[PDB]
Amino acid sequence: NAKVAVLGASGGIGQPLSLLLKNSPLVSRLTLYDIAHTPGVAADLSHIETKAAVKGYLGPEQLPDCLKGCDVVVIPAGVPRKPGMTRDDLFNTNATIVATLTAACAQHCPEAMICVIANPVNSTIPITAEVFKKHGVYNPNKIFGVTTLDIVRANTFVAELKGLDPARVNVPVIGGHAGKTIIPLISQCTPKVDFPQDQLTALTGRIQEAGTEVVKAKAGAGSATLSMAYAGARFVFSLVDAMNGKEGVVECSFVKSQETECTYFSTPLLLGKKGIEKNLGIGKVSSFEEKMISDAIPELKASIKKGEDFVKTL
Amino acid sequence: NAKVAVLGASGGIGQPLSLLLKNSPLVSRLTLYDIAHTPGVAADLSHIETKAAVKGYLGPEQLPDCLKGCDVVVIPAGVPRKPGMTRDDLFNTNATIVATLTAACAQHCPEAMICVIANPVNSTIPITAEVFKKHGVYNPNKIFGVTTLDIVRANTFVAELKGLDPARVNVPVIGGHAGKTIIPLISQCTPKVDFPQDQLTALTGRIQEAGTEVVKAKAGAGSATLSMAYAGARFVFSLVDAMNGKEGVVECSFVKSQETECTYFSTPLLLGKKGIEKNLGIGKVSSFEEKMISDAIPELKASIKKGEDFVKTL
Amino acid sequence: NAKVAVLGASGGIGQPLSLLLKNSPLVSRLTLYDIAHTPGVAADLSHIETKAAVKGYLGPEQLPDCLKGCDVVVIPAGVPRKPGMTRDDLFNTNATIVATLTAACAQHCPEAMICVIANPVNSTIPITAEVFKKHGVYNPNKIFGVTTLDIVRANTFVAELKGLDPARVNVPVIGGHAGKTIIPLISQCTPKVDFPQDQLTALTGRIQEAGTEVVKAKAGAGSATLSMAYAGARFVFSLVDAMNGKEGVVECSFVKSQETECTYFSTPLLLGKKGIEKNLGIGKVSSFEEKMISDAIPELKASIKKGEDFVKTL
Amino acid sequence: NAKVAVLGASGGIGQPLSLLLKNSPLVSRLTLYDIAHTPGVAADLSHIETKAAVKGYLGPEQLPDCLKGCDVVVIPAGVPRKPGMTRDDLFNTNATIVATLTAACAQHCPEAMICVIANPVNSTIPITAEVFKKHGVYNPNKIFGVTTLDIVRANTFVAELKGLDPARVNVPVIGGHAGKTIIPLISQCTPKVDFPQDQLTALTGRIQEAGTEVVKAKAGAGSATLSMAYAGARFVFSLVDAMNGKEGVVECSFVKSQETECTYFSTPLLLGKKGIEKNLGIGKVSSFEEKMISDAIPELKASIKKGEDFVKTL
């Protein structure tokens, strides 16, 4: 079974994400990293009656030990938004956080699956790749920008409008994770759904700005933590099931891609033992959906460039 | 199709508990109450792709709306311990919180299952019962002091020592929830385990002081939260399974009892459609376990009387 | 010339108290101790344009370095109250904190003035004294329970009612620091003030419950911090000035005594180079005030015994 | 008889600031505003034996009552930096906070002195000015960006290197408050000091990034709070002294200026009853200092226009 490392385990996302991972029979070893509180979070989780052995590591001195033999590394670490902030306002802090932590992964568990939640994902994935490139252990099949929350939100909002059980809805979401770059493919939704354009546009904008909606609702107490923990655990479970030989596992994720002109893009991915087995690509989309893909590419390029430029300055 | 209310849903226990409940197909409605942050927590959780309708309530005016029509109310509300404190040290603050919240339950959802997590459970359950008596709606088959975390700990520690799958381990734990009153019935464990005496003594002590162990490890940042969320969720699920007619559902819980001279006591309970179907009692125990029961009684009685006396000062 | 150590410098009282000490011409060196955040606190304060050299220490291993050569040790360390709690609810944690910290003082700066702010003062001073006795380093003229806040409050409340400037009001307060052990001597007030018995009783009760009123006003966010830092600073400045040879320095403080049948009591103290120069005693009091002293004695003796018995068990 | 309002009085800066203001004989009315905790902060502070009347206000509804008849308004409200953030990263959040609070000032106490601590000061003072203009109550003599912490730091560092008492050191700092816009005029220091060129660049670098060093030293637990409180208090005292007719009070502050190409600039100001009595200007500076001024102007203009643009789209 899998050894999973959580970098930033003591934060708002990290604690409940670590709880969901500990509850899973797919995990046998769970290592927790942060700069504060980890030993306490680990002692807490270690009492839970599941097989996953839990250990907390504190400070960069113990970071190498945390990473040894890891099959998957999830990185919820990062500063959350306050009302008013854009995801780009977090770029500077989260870029150096992701740069520092992915360097440690490249040095200590370069063969591991790397799942980045830290925002803005549209720049932090490029950063992760370039950091891995500079260490000479670059593998684009094992680096994932976790955009799963966008799919989870689309499913819920569609299900609510159509009176369906969200657990049986699937809405592909492509592009990236910002405004802007979030493209819900309602045309490719299962079960098949039918919305008027004004209702479709409202639904689309709702999915696009759902992160901001939660920031407003929290009124300065941060951004999505619990739903983000759910989405992160879902993606890790999908990846680990696939690594154990489960067939047909498809998740959208922001990865190194030659699907569009963007070197990085989020599409549905067939997962497996090497990570990305096959990029299933964008597929058949509406004219409305195609317009969005075109409007988003400009921003994606900037975000990719910004992230790549940041690594060169190091 | 269960409707569940969480009173204290914005706290360290409450948030991860609410996440676990939201993730469950047993829950169709999840109402969250606190004095702060509930709208943000509910907005966060409402995005998760499960059927449970989530709503946040804030302030005294909204508490009745939160409770109306509930099948189960879980009360993690309360102040946590710091290193050096006993659970009894929290009595004066948490007794008032439990009194107020359980009074609201007696008025607005008297038929619901009331699950009290707030410590010290040995006194706050007596408070809850007396509050329900005052409102003329006391049903001892529906008031539960959640001691599940002790069983979860016992399962984990037994499994670690013997090298077992803790999912397969069930250790009955009786008495109450405070240092000396926690009595692990290792002799009644399934699968049956034999420990040499020195391991048995260290194991029993470890279970009894497990809560203090986590408080120490957290070093001033509170008590167990994530494992208490796990334990609380587990107990709610067992209760909901029983209400849906599932047979053979057994959980230990601190309830109104006849087993000893203590009017409240924790034993294994067969659960059913109206809560406690049958108190299975203490059963056959070792001499060592019998001695531990004898030692627990005076402290239990003292904690029980304290709770009763507090209600008489209201 | 004075070197002052602050034990608990990162806490709610500790940070503002450290700020006030940093701003004083009397302090040459300011060492700050805590189990978290001290380096950031020391760095923050070291930027202030005063002569005191500031350094932050972190964890028990660095406590000896923090204490070496200290002239005055201030101990604001400890857990604050939440609404509902009494000061004795903090006993178990704050007793353990005080016994540990004062044991380090007795070893590493036995000659220093020990100013204890940690509550309950009526027990924590007896604890401090017993720890110094156990190390064979007894000086009852150097151990102070900081009750200054009671005098500060009394001054303010009298001043508000009579329309005076609180800066020019002085009210001796004797006894201890908990509920009815707080005995303000309004008869000895300067300037002379005329209160009828009904207003006198209201004013006295206000002074006695002032700490509880702040806890209620803070509604879960702790106890008095800023006013406590002010009073702690005032007492440390008075003590240091007396150590500089300043004449006629008098402050009420809870110390080991033989003024009443309590072996510990707060009275006006003439301070000097060796700490307590002379205990000025109670002086002449009204009948109302004599009754309060008599009613206070049972509670004080019990708190003293509780504190002393705590050290003997360790 | 100065009435002082503190907007953001419950924050890390606001609480110790409010304490220092409460301790001063210059203040007669102290009104505290925030969105949480102010009643408790005011209760705490109201016990201190000084004459300042203290009142806590809570939420936008009580903001007019807080500001009514104020002579000075100090605004420490704002999100603090975490390691890796620039002050400009805080812009979107803090620009909204400042625009809201200053609009209320313009509506309810338009003749008061407005002192903004909220970062980035280089943009937030322009926001304040434009907001006041939009209400037609613009007075450039009464709006102050509090840069005093830069001077306090410069004094301390100079004094440390030269073995001087920092209380009797004065180093003018000009420009703005962000990165290279901080320009310490070591050539104008009193007493006169000579530094070799290598030390001067190091000394200048230390002063420029001093805020960042405290952020890193706090390692995620915020930015400077206690030194900022000290600096905020110093500036308010200077300004209040001058309003009572005290002569020769000089402070550097980021104000509306015609001293450079920039609309706003920090230089030594002579303060008076009207606020800015006279802008004392940059004065004679070295070639090194002239170079820094030249390099800084492009960044200052950008920050200025950014803040102006923000208000122009409300």
Curated annotation (Swiss-Prot), chains A, B, C, D:
It is found in: Mitochondrion matrix. The keyword Oxidoreductase applies. Gene3D superfamilies: Lactate dehydrogenase/glycoside hydrolase, family 4, C-terminal, NAD(P)-binding Rossmann-like Domain. PROSITE patterns: MDH (PS00068). Substrate binds at residues 81, 87, 119, 153. Changing residue 278 to R: No activation of enzyme activity on treatment with TSA or NAM. NAD(+) binds at residues 8-14, 34, 94, 117-119, 228. Enzyme activity is enhanced by acetylation. It catalyses: (S)-malate + NAD(+) = oxaloacetate + NADH + H(+). Glycans are attached at residue 10. PANTHER family: MALATE AND LACTATE DEHYDROGENASE (PTHR11540), MALATE DEHYDROGENASE, MITOCHONDRIAL (PTHR11540:SF16). It is linked to Developmental and epileptic encephalopathy 51: A form of epileptic encephalopathy, a heterogeneous group of severe early-onset epilepsies characterized by refractory seizures, neurodevelopmental impairment, and poor prognosis. Development is normal prior to seizure onset, after which cognitive and motor delays become apparent. DEE51 is an autosomal recessive form characterized by onset of intractable seizures and hypotonia in the first days or weeks of life, and severely delayed psychomotor development. Belongs to the LDH/MDH superfamily. MDH type 1 family. This is Malate dehydrogenase, mitochondrial. It comes from Homo sapiens (Human). The lineage of its organism: Eukaryota, Metazoa, Chordata, Craniata, Vertebrata. The gene is MDH2.
